[PDB]
Design a protein around this ligand. Structure first.
Ligand code: QOM
Ligand code: ANP
Ligand code: MG
Lengths: 280, 205, 88, 288
């Protein structure tokens, strides 16, 4: 099916900026479609084992998930291609604009909650990678999701890793506990605070990795009491951000939260905002 | 650099298989006598090295070469706080590099722009890496496996050790493992004493 | 020396509700339908109470505090027993 | 050991059978559980909202299954890490959390908020596994462990008494007790240099024979079936590997974690003359 022979080379946002991706326009019927450069050094014995775990990535056609076109190998790198979105990601928009108002935040929360609920209910796949860097926005006004951990063997065989000055892990995760669905809620709440204020909130408004990983575990979780917001937003973030996993609500009981219902019953112009922020 | 074929880094300086590839790809159960002999040779070589006021700043299981039972230690003058350098996404952590660092070194810097040398190396921190080597050579695999970097950093920084669920032997080997991984620097042993401790055979054959 | 709370039955739970927090008398029947025995009295959570039907905030807070006080009072009876066992 | 027992691949029939022994008041929910085909993976991640989709409108009936599920998760996921240092983690973490929260609040002329009592209760609950493992066979024949047990018990008794006695202020007292608890937990984590605090428990298989093996099970409040008062007759310990402190988890290849003591004795006495069990032996040393 898919092969690297028929994929061309097009323009890109940057060269080496963070990770490396490259837009591709298919020669046949002009399929505009992006590519992901994933580089590994693995013996061929487990190569097939990794290869067999990307079919579940294509067997999911929910509206709030980026499409999957195929996967192939070419000269020491695994190539995985997904539908190209002309909007970008929440990181870039956050850096340019500065913050995001309440209504857009509510719509994004609704979209990600629906996507996570679908994934967990249908295939029992835990995202484990939830951050503003994994939410793709289109131009019409849609919201999608990508880069969710499906193949655990790829983690066990990853060539390298990166840490960075921003971490979105959970206090139970840093103490060696297993991965559960309740870990995603903490990261989602932290992301919500990040897009609400404009910066990483863990250092209250630098210093080594350990002094962050131990500040997260011991110090009280951040709160948005220092500015005038909607009360329901504050209670939603409060429920999302709690140290003990048992006090953190499952996704099926924040979908009935008053804030989410208010967001659902309303209607706000996402298309105008996304068009204005980007270059038309 | 003669007694234990110490290498200072095709007629000479030949390269081949190592200890890491041996114990991993071959999956061969090393005999107890071979384990004791290899440990004794490594201890003697490092004790000789420590006597010339030069610090082995990077000891892993890929920096040892075994040829017909003769150990070789190499690449003891390269690693530093500048050799690792990566992009704005954060520090690039190799796959099996965070389980060889003592707690005093695990406090690395995030922005990848440290002025001068961030780390400080001492012979007290070097013997810590010997404990991991013996653990992996007697048990069969690494430590802190199937964990992310952001978890290993915090777990090690608290002063922890992998639970000994895969070892079945006397109290001597476990006592030595606890001796190597001691949280306080000064209470760690020195290679002169460790060679004597390992010389008294815990068991024979 | 009251009996161990782990062995309590329902009747003991309604007696406890009558004695300790008899002021909020319109919610006692809720414990009857939902079968709150001794074991479940320890692990009742704020979400669990909210589900059970304590709509008003103040009454739910008062009941939460009373149950918390009871759970703390039953904790001493374990520490002392373990201390006596340790002394032997 | 591990091959016989798994929890992430349980067929719905096994989940249905295990739930039966939890209580005699849950006979009517077996059919509904069988209909939806709730496997082991879904069982381990059960939540209160889901249980209301199977007709379990009673909170008291929910709590029993929640407790059994939590016990099963604790036994399965952390079987190979249940050592002395791991239990010392929670003793320290909760104390430091409470201390930092109290320092940040900087409250004055106010009563102890219910959240503070909740954290205090959570902290004392974490002491129970530590003391329960400390007073057993590995650490009952040495003086240092006894002194550590006495010190931590004194600190816990002060913690509980100060809170329960009267309201506010005792806030500096509770802060100081938290600091002492944290320091002692750090001492057991780092300073102690004995290799016992590293080795966790282990699994084993035991066969017993129409003689009734007289190990009177003294079930605690948590359903942990611990063997006590092994009869002095020679064959019981000559042919069996049971000892004081041993824990029974499986009968004839069937998990019984979190059950009620009544059915365990009933199952044992109604079992076949030849029986097979799984024992969670206390840590030892293979001195060869
Ligand atoms: C240490 C740690 O947490 N590791 C970890 C933990 C969970 C997830 C990941 N994970 C990841 O982060 N990425 C991002 C970084 C590139 C992946 O792309 C990625 C990936 N591919 C992928 C999947 C779907 C789509 I639509 C696009 C894709 F590209 N597949 C197939 C995975 O199963 C993993 C291994 C990925 C990594
Ligand atoms: N199909 C796509 N559509 C739009 N943007 C894309 C697409 N694929 C990749 N990108 C962008 O490519 C850039 C590099 O992505 P990548 O390095 O894989 O992840 P990241 O979110 O930027 N960083 P990180 O959170 O550390 O993994 C980001 O700005 C993405 O938004
Ligand atoms: Mg990416």
């Amino acid at each position: 099916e898919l092969s690297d022979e028929d994929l061309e080379k097009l323009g890109e946002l940057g060269s080496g900026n963070g990770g490396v991706v490259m837009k591709v326009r298919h020669t046949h019927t002009h399929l505009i479609m992006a590519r992901k450069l994933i580089h590994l050094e693995v013996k061929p014995a487990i190569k097939k084992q990794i290869l067999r775990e990307l079919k579940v990535l294509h067997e999911c056609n929910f509206p709030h998930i980026v499409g999957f076109y195929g996967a192939f190998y070419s000269d020491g790198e695994i190539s995985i291609c997904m539908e190209y979105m002309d909007g970008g990601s929440l990181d870039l928009i956050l850096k340019r604009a500065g913050r995001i108002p309440e209504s857009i935040l509510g719509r994004i929360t609704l979209a990600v909650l629906k996507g996570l609920s679908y994934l967990r209910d249908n295939h029992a796949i835990i995202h484990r990678d939830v951050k503003p860097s994994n939410i793709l926005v289109n131009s019409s006004g849609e919201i999608k999701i990508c880069d969710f951990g499906v193949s655990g063997q790829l983690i066990d065989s990853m060539a390298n890793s990166f840490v960075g000055t921003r971490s979105y892990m959970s206090p139970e995760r840093l103490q060696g506990t297993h991965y559960s669905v309740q870990s995603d809620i903490w990261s989602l709440g932290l992301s919500l605070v990040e897009m609400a204020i404009g910066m990483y909130p863990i250092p209250p408004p630098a210093m080594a990795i350990f002094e962050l990983l131990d500040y997260i575990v011991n110090e009280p979780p951040p709160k948005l009491e220092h500015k005038i917001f909607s009360t329901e937003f504050k209670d939603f973030v409060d429920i999302c951000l709690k140290k003990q996993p048992d006090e953190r609500a499952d996704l099926k009981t924040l979908l009935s939260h008053p804030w989410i219902r208010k967001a659902e019953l309303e209607e706000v112009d996402i298309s105008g905002w996304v068009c204005k922020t980007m270059d038309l | 650099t003669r007694h234990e074929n110490l290498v200072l880094f095709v007629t000479s300086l030949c390269k081949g298989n190592t200890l890491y590839t041996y114990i991993h790809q071959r999956r061969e159960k090393f005999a107890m006598n071979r384990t004791l002999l290899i440990a004794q040779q490594i201890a003697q070589g490092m004790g000789y090295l420590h006597a010339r006021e030069i610090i082995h700043k990077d000891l892993r299981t890929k920096n040892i070469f075994i040829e017909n039972g003769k150990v070789i230690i190499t690449d003891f003058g390269l690693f530093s706080s500048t050799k690792l350098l990566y992009c704005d996404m954060g520090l690039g952590v190799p796959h099996n590099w965070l389980c060889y660092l003592a707690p005093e070194l695990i406090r690395a810097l995030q922005p990848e722009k440290p002025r001068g040398e961030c780390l400080e190396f001492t012979p007290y921190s070097d013997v810590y890496s010997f404990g991991t080597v013996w653990y992996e050579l007697i048990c069969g695999e690494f430590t802190f496996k199937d964990q992310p970097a952001e978890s290993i950093i915090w777990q090690v920084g608290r002063g922890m050790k992998q639970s000994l669920a895969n070892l079945q032997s006397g109290r001597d080997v476990k006592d030595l493992l606890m001796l190597c991984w001691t949280y306080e620097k000064e209470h760690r042993p020195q290679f002169a004493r460790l060679l004597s401790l390992l010389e008294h055979l815990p068991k024979k054959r | 020396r009251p009996k161990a709370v782990y062995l309590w039955t329902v009747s003991d739970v309604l007696k406890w509700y009558r004695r300790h927090c008899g002021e909020y008398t319109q919610y006692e029947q809720l414990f009857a339908q939902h079968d709150i025995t001794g074991r479940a009295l320890l692990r009742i959570t704020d979400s669990s109470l909210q589900r059970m039907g304590v709509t008003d905030n103040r009454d739910r807070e008062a009941i939460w505090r009373e149950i918390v006080k009871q759970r703390l009072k039953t904790d001493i009876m374990e520490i002392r027993d373990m201390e006596r066992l340790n002394i032997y | 050991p591990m091959a016989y027992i798994n929890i992430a691949e349980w067929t719905p029939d096994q989940v249905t059978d295990w739930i039966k022994g939890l209580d005699e008041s849950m006979k009517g929910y077996l059919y509904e559980f069988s209909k939806q085909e709730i496997g082991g993976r879904a069982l381990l991640n059960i939540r209160p909202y889901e249980l209301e989709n199977l007709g379990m409108l009673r909170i008291g009936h929910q709590e029993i299954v929640l407790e059994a599920v939590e016990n099963l998760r604790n036994f399965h996921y952390h079987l190979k890490n249940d050592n002395l240092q791991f239990m010392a983690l929670h003793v320290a973490t909760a104390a430091k959390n409470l201390h930092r929260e109290l320092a940040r609040n900087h409250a004055e002329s106010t009563k102890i908020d219910t959240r503070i009592l909740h954290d205090i209760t959570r902290t004392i609950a974490t002491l129970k596994p530590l003391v329960g493992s400390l007073e057993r066979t590995p650490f009952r024949k040495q003086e240092m462990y006894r002194e550590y047990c006495g010190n931590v018990l004194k600190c816990g008794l002060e913690l509980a008494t100060i809170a329960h006695r009267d309201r506010f202020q005792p806030v500096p007292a509770i802060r100081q007790s938290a600091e002492r608890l944290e320091n002692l937990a750090n001492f057991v984590i780092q300073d102690i240099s004995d290799p016992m605090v590293l080795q966790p428990a282990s699994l084993n298989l035991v066969t017993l024979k129409e003689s009734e093996l007289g190990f009177n099970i003294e079930s605690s409040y948590n359903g942990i079936h611990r063997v006590t008062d092994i009869k002095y007759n020679s064959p019981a310990h000559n042919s069996g590997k049971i000892e004081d402190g041993d824990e029974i988890v499986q009968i004839n290849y069937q998990t019984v974690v979190g059950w009620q003591h009544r059915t365990v004795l009933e199952h044992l006495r109604e079992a076949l003359p030849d029986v097979v069990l799984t024992v969670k032996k206390r840590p030892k040393h293979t001195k060869m």
